[PDB]
Design a protein around this ligand. Structure first.
Ligand SMILES: [Cl-]
Ligand SMILES: [Cl-]
Ligand SMILES: [Cl-]
Length: 290
């Protein structure tokens, strides 16, 4: 048989340590797909070498390792081992603490097609070794827990290899990786599929005159949007009259109704719209003074 056929995908997250002078580094990798593992994975090995210092090695039986690094630059390697031998290594530079990330991807966009969420960008002008893509759902009913994947340096379009949901807003971040460290990240929001909002805006009067009323409302919580809100519509009518409808820019949170009749009972509601349709909020009432 054969040893594993490629290095695992390999990345890290870094934070300040409780110990002065150190950084807590969470090294992470993905279990190779079975076709690349070529047999039972026995374990992994990480090495860490600080510039002009002694190499540290760790045997790991898991897909994550937490280490304490100084503020210096490190070379990190990861190999996966099976009964036959060791894979080629995944290699990263973990830069010194004064490292300035530059050279982000340009023209980042994301869009659904064929039931996958595609992400594409213009390649940076530098030689990219590989890319890290990260994503999480934006929601007030669940924290942003990231999943991630790795791409070869020649890639400029790919799809997220997760099993995603419709009507959820994904925050997607693309980071180029260079020989000397990560590039600066860029992020975009996108939906695998949009739907009409689950709730409409709740409208209230700020001020009411004989012939005008100032309305205001809070923006919809992201969770209930189910897509990018493109615009609102205000519908209003005298108690005895026909309905009037006026469109409102999605970036606004106030609007003045005009040409109102004095001494009159008004009923009013608003709807919010995504590309897929709209949803009415609750009806509200006010009476103009005489
Ligand atoms: Cl991956
Ligand atoms: Cl965006
Ligand atoms: Cl008025």
């Amino acid at each position: 048989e054969d040893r594993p056929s490629k290095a695992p995908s390999f990345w890290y997250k870094i934070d300040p340590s409780h110990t002065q002078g150190y950084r807590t580094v969470q090294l992470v990798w993905k279990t190779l797909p079975p076709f690349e593992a070529n047999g039972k994975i026995l374990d992994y090995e990480v090495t860490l070498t600080r510039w002009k210092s002694h190499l540290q090695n760790y045997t790991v039986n898991a897909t994550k390792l937490t280490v304490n690094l100084t503020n210096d630059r490190y070379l990190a390697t990861l190999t996966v081992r099976n009964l036959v031998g060791k894979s080629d290594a995944a290699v990263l530079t973990i830069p010194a603490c004064d490292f300035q990330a530059t050279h982000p991807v340009m023209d980042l966009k994301a869009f659904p097609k064929d039931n996958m969420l595609w992400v594409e960008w213009t390649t940076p002008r530098e030689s990219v070794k590989k890319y890290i893509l990260e994503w999480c759902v934006l929601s007030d009913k669940a924290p942003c827990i990231t999943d991630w994947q790795q791409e070869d340096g020649t890639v400029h379009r790919t799809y997220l290899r997760g099993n995603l949901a419709e009507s959820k807003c994904y925050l997607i971040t693309v980071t180029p990786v260079y020989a000397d460290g990560p590039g600066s990240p860029e992020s975009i929001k996108a939906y695998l599929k949009q739907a009409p909002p689950s709730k409409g805006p709740t409208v209230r009067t700020k001020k009411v005159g004989k012939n005008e009323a100032v309305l205001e409302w809070d923006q919809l919580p992201v969770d209930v949007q189910n897509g990018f809100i493109r615009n609102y519509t205000i519908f209003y009518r005298t108690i005895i009259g026909n309905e009037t409808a006026v469109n409102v820019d999605s970036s606004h949170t106030e609007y003045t109704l005009s040409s109102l009749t004095s001494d009159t009972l008004y009923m009013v509601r608003m709807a919010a719209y995504t590309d897929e349709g709209g949803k009415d909020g609750p009806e509200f009432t006010f009476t103009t003074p005489k």
